[model samples]
Target: GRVKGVTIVKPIVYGNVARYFGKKREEDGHTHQWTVYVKPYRNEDMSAYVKKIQFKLHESYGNPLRVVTKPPYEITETGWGEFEIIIKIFFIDPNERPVTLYHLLKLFQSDTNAMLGKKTVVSEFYDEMIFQDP
Candidate 1:
């Protein structure tokens, strides 16, 4: 039999089970508030990117989520830990289904969010946007 579906038939990413890369710590452990930090993108404008994402998210999600502020990421082989927008997104999980890379990719690829390195400035200096495949 051949496998065909709108979603990937097999899983391709795994992590701390409760925790995943690109996702923030505050968002884990059965936490209702989903949080994410959109770090600076080296040469890009952090402020502009935040403003854009904020507006876009509001338009798409139909509500104004909250944004957290923090220092820009420090320059190192590894980012985030080094400087990083600590944007916090407040969302109520509305899924009876599990989350997968394909789904995450689709969401991340949307307008409200910028690919880590594109709008945010951190990905510019440190490592490129990276995700783990299971």
Candidate 2:
């Protein structure tokens, strides 16, 4: 069931957090890793309002279509590159439209000094979900 009558607005945030070490730790591939996730903004409770989420990854990854059904809606991975990631959120209500989110799987930092020294280059954006009588 969803909020009835008065519109409900839920602020949500989604993005990637990557921690990369320098070339000294590098092997034949990029050694750093990152995580992609979606959570309620303002540290709101995740009272199971979502059913599941779909994460679409790179072509090199086998079965790139990832399905997750749990809190913190986060997935960790290892890669040396960057690309577009699609995050689909499914509400428990059958009438609710599944929200689709896109993000750039960033592996590098913008500033020369920042990318090398930082452990977690956090990148996230906030948006609101509006629900009305259905």
Error of 2 at 46 (Å): 2.6
Q: What is the TM-score of each candidate against the true structure?
A: 0.19, 0.82
Cα RMSD to the true fold for all candidates: 17.5, 3.3
In the range 28-119, model 2's lDDT, one tens digit per residue, is 48666789989888776554467788999998777899888877788888888898999998876667788889999877777964857765
The lDDT for every candidate, in the order shown, is 0.24, 0.80
Native-structure RMSD, model 2: 3.3
lDDT of 1 by residue, 9-117 (tens): 2211111111123544453322112233334344453332222222112222323343333233121111122112222311122221222111111112224444433
lDDT of 2: 0.80
List the pairs of residues colliding in candidate 2.
none
TM-score computed on alpha carbons, candidate 2: 0.82
Which regions in candidate 1 have their CA more than 4 angstroms from the true location? 1-34, 43-45, 48-52, 55-64, 67-134
The per-prediction tally of clashing pairs is: 14, 0
